[PDB]
Amino acid sequence: KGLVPGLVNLGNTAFMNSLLQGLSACPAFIRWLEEFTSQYSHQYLSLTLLHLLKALSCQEVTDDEVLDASCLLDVLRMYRWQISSFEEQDAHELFHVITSSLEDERDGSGSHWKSQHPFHGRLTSNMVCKHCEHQSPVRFDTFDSLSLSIPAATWGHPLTLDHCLHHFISSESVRDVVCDNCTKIEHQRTTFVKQLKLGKLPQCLCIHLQRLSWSSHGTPLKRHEHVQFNEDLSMDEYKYHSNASTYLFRLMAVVVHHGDMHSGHFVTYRRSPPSARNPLSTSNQWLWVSDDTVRKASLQEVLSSSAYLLFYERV
């Protein structure tokens, strides 16, 4: 077969089990983990993560294997993420908790302090004052995921992932900005135009569709609309540099939320482990995992899902 092992959900941990299936569908993240882990050759999160990430990336060793990631949650919630005992949580929040530990872990290593994990990308913040036309020097900031506000729906047209990306990189006018050039001409306050674009792309792209918005009325609102993503994603449009290398990404896993704005459940659409004969080629058989339950899924089912976290890996 081509089934992956499940994950035991004890006390509302689908947010974790779902994220792990998605992370384990990323060969590059496991390769960086195995290389990073090599410096240690039990509170090393990279090690405990690799143990579960490796097991989920290979097929189940036994019949209908159901794994247990209590080790991961108990390591994180000791000091880093002291969460209430049975409280439902956001899978995207755990992703950034897992990232911050890997980054902290990498910062405390003499040999690997320079090695970035494959989810590491860079954003560019461009600014220019409208009143004096003076451009600001480009800033560069790190991102481990792209949290895209889902834009307003068009009449009958479906919402696309590319619409979200275009909305994230779109330009905009920010008011009440302090201008140095204008200040010396006091502290003058003009309005600038600001724009985000991607300076460096990760090998492992994690997209976060903000399905939780804030209404005009002042209440949490959950966006249920289908956002249409593709199996193949081109990121050349959203890069800062003109220098043309092609940036094609291929979908590995989809994390989906089921519920309202307050609670619910997380499931994952992911690819199958590659065949033993050709283990460096991405499988085409997709899988559906709801904690312990692992079942075969069609590519159409995957793409027809209300995506929340989309995991891409560069080809």
Partner: protein, 76 residues
């Protein structure tokens, strides 16, 4: 100093903060402009989710940094 916050729309706003300010201080100032209760806010900067009880200094948040605001979609 002056920092930036990309809100739930993607519209960026101007914040007035100091390096010694706590993260809940920043969240409370976002509530005054956006109306989202701080307990429901998540501020991400440079790929790190900022923690309450910490200051912009502890994260090295320099002037005109861009913070990212997101909500908490729980599922268990």
């Amino acid at each position: 100093m002056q920092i930036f916050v990309k809100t739930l729309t993607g519209k960026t706003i101007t914040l007035e903060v100091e390096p010694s300010d706590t993260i809940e201080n920043v969240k409370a100032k976002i509530q005054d402009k956006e109306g989202i209760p701080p307990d429901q806010q998540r501020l991400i900067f440079a790929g790190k989710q900022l923690e309450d009880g910490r200051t912009l200094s502890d994260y090295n948040i320099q002037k005109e940094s861009t913070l990212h605001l997101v909500l908490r979609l729980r599922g268990g």
